[PDB]
């Protein structure tokens, strides 16, 4: 029983280390959240802006490699297939 305790203590210290960071932004919570609401709104807006820029412009910080992954290159395939829609549709000869 007393032999096992060091392992339990260190493992639970690691788990409390994992949860304490989340508790840091959760020290306090009042009804109607007078300032947490504004802070979280700013966080969400910044996340959306940086993700839009990452999706289209191609900013740093680990853009996903799974799929063709976002409008940026779909938007490019438009900008470089439209020069095929120009060629294809327009034609006439021997009437001109």
């Amino acid at each position: 029983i007393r032999d096992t305790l060091p392992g339990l203590r260190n493992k639970l210290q690691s788990q409390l280390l994992s949860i304490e960071k989340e508790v840091e932004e959760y020290k306090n919570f009042r009804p109607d959240d007078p300032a947490r609401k504004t802070k979280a709104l700013l966080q969400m807006v910044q996340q959306f802006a940086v993700d839009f820029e990452k999706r289209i412009e191609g900013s740093g910080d680990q853009i996903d490699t799974y799929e063709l992954s976002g409008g940026a290159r779909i938007n490019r395939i438009f900008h470089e297939r439209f020069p095929f829609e120009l060629v294809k549709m327009e034609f006439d000869e021997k009437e001109l």
């Binding site: 007393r2 305790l5 203590r9 639970l12 210290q13 409390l16 949860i19 304490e20 959760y26 919570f29």
Partner: peptide, 27 residues
């Protein structure tokens, strides 16, 4: 997120109690 946050709070309190019990038992 609200249920997750409350369950985090309860989990943190339970872990605090568990480490207090380890402290008072290891002695």
């Amino acid at each position: 997120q609200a249920q997750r946050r409350d369950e985090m709070l309860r989990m943190y309190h339970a872990l605090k109690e568990a480490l207090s019990i380890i402290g008072n038992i290891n002695t």
